[PDB]
Structure formats: C-alpha cells, structure tokens
Design a protein around this ligand. Structure first.
Ligand SMILES: O=C(O)Cc1cc(I)c(Oc2cc(I)c(O)c(I)c2)c(I)c1
Ligand SMILES: O=C(O)Cc1cc(I)c(Oc2cc(I)c(O)c(I)c2)c(I)c1
Lengths: 116, 118, 118, 116
C-alpha cells in the first residue's frame, strides 16, 4: 500500500469513521482526473486505494469530505472539505501516509513519507 | 478594520510570521469554476488585509490558496505540499469578520477560522 | 506594545477566540520549583496582555499554564486535558517579543510561539 | 496495551525516532511520582509502558522530551518539552493513545480514547 489516509476527530477523541475520501491526479491537459476513492473504516484508516504499478509520478489531490462528516453529527462546520495537494514519486517510488486531525473550525494535516 | 476577510500565516520552523507569501482568493462561479477574486502577499507581520470590502463580499463559496511551496524553496527547504487551500462558505447569517489562519511546516500545515462579528 | 510576553487562545469548535480563560505564568526558581510570576484571564479577543514588563522578564525558564478544563466544562463539554502547559526558555540573545498561541479542542490542543523583535 | 504514544516530525515528514518519554502519576501528597518511561521506536511509537493492572485511576502526566530530539538534529527549539496532563480511568478502564506532531516552534497533541 503506497497511499494511505488516517483521519481523527479532535472533538470526540476518536478515529473519524466513514469519512469519504476522493483522490485525483493532474492530467496532461492540466485538469483533475478521478484516481480513486473510499471511506475510512472503524479505525479511521483508508487503505487499498491503489497499487505501486498504477501510482505513477504526478501531482495528486486528496480530498477529505469533512463537511458531510460533521453534519451527520449535528454540527455545522466551516470548511467544505480538506484538500491535500502534492507531487508524488518524482524521485522514485515512495509510500505516503496522509494524516488529518479534524475539528469544526479547524484541521491540520501532515504527511509521512517512507522509502520502501 | 471593516475588512470582511483577513489572512494570517505563520512559520512553525522559525517561529515567526510567514512573510511575502503569495495568497490568491477565488469564488465559485455558476458554471462550477473558480474565478479570481483577490490576491496579495503577506506583510512583515504575516498578515494580508484589504482583500475585499463588505459590498463585494457576498454569500458564496470561496477558496483561499496559499503558495507555501515557493515560501519553503526560498528558504532552501524541500516542502511536501504544492500549496495550502481553504475552501469555505461565507454566510451573512453567521458573524461578519473572517480571519483565516495557517501555521506552516515543510510536511504539515494547520488552518483555523476565526469568525467574530463586531 | 512593549509587552514582552503575550498570550492568545482560540476555540476550534466554535471558531472564535477563547474568552475568560484563566492563564497562570510561572518561572523556574533556583531550588528547582515553580514560583508564581503573573496571571490573568483572556479578554473578548482571546488575548492576554500586560503580564509583565521588560525589566521583570529576565532570562530563565517559564511555564505558561492554561486552564482549558474549566473552559470546556463551562460549555457543557467533557475535555480530556487537565490543562495545557507551555514550558520554554527566554533568552535575550534571541528576539524580544514572545507570543504564545494555543488552539483548543476537547481532545486536542496545539500551540505555537511567535518570536519577533521590533 | 492501555497507554501508547505516537510522535511525528513535521519538518522531515517521518516518525520521530528515539524520543524520550517519561510518564508520571499524581501521588496522594499531590506530587509527581515516576510511573514509566521509554523511547519511541523506528515507527515513532512507544508501547509496553504499563499494564491494565497497574494503570489505575489517577491524574497522569506524559512528558515528551522534544528539546533533546531537535538539538540532536542541529536545531535550537523553543520548548523545553511537551506535556500532556489528563485524568485516566475515572469511569472504568480505557485505552489511551497520545499522539504528538512536532515542529521546532510548535507542537500539537491529540488523544484517542477507546473502550475495551
Ligand atoms: O496550530 C498550531 O499548532 C498552533 C496555532 C495556534 C493558533 I491561536 C493559530 O492561529 C492564530 C490566529 C491568530 I488571529 C494569530 O494572531 C495567531 I499569533 C495564531 C495557529 I494558524 C496555529
Ligand atoms: O495534530 C495534533 O493535534 C495531534 C496529532 C498527532 C498525530 I502523530 C497525528 O497523526 C497521526 C498519524 C498516525 I499513522 C496515527 O496512527 C495517529 I493515532 C495520529 C494527528 I492526525 C494529530
């Protein structure tokens, strides 16, 4: 698994469950092309998004649908979603973990990159 | 200050405001595309004021894009993100003033919104 | 403002400054214990100014304690932390002004320091 | 494992390795009593700090020696250490994960609490 996502809830102190995540890749014509999608599990993690074979060099955008997550909890959040845009594998294949901590009016994201 | 929208950027590596950071603001148009709205560069205090006025700032979806990549390269540091973006809906129902704050690190960034009405 | 030390607290759940938050500042004494130095409550803008002066603020180790627990209980929310603490060394070598900022959530808090000299 | 710690480095985008962690418990006389200590591993995690049997109700302090971590990297950090103080198991036994993201002039910490 070359691309994984981990989301946590800072209001409840638990993993953010069933959060929709859409992954896009910058196409040749400079437009966002659908690449993969999923929902986080019980532990707030999302795996199996792609393979080393399909995860080629490029600029990717990871969109986390925070808005839907909060509303389903009766909270009216500030952000429409959280976006993480980055260039991947431009110096050979690597493994990426995109982590996100969510709050109604705030979120922070970090990336952990390891060489296989 | 009657500025409806403000931006504040900080540097978590050097513990100082993030200066000369390019900031571009966009608004969602009917045809579902992003059209330029305002832009500028953070000052010596890492702030960016006077991006718009109450009259022009109507309800709708806005995107605030911060060129963090160029900020880090200028310091000789390899960043992870292409840029940082904050997408939100501005409603007159809620308070009046919007402050978008961002704390930057090479592989991480956090952002918060302060919505207060005077 | 010549205030050498400033504190800013924000609420990430309601997107507003954290008001009436108790803040206690301590300094490390020779016998390795913490002795009261200054204290106060954040204002309507979540800020706390005039905690000390240049004369009294000498080099040494300081601890800034924020009573976050009472803040959350007042909102009817069960917090995780007893309080938030920021322990740092103040040196004349480095810049002059210190701003300690904290973003609060029930199960999480982040803090950053802005050190700038005018 | 009822108490685990996870630390990440936001400057290098990797787990924070060999970070010293000391855990204290508030004693009857209102003083901090040593409870456990360790260093994070290759993955930036610290496990095996205590057992469900020894981890009784009380106020605990988790101290992460960030200062030493940064200096060993040639960086002069702002904080002496990072402190997480909390009341644990006051409503029955729970599992705690204390997570921390570190930067030279900043750090954020969150807690994940799950019921066994
Ligand atoms: O997230 C962290 O790790 C710590 C942190 C704390 C605060 I509080 C922040 O927000 C502001 C907002 C205003 I308005 C300020 O003037 C200042 I100084 C900081 C940010 I971004 C980041
Ligand atoms: O930002 C804060 O206030 C605190 C914080 C600390 C960490 I470290 C985080 O990242 C991870 C990454 C992995 I992989 C985990 O398994 C877990 I648990 C948390 C997040 I999001 C938020």
């Amino acid at each position: 698994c070359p691309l994984m996502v981990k989301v946590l809830d800072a209001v409840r102190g638990s993993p953010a469950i069933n959060v929709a995540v859409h992954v896009f890749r910058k196409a040749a014509d400079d437009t966002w092309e659908p690449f993969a999608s999923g929902k986080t599990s019980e532990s707030g993690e999302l795996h199996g998004l792609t393979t080393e074979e399909e995860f080629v060099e490029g600029i990717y955008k990871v969109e986390i649908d925070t808005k839907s997550y909060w509303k389903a909890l009766g909270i009216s959040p500030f952000h429409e979603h959280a976006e993480v845009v980055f260039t991947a594998n431009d110096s050979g294949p690597r493994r990426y973990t995109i982590a996100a901590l969510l709050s109604p009016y705030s979120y922070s994201t970090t990336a952990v990159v390891t060489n296989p």
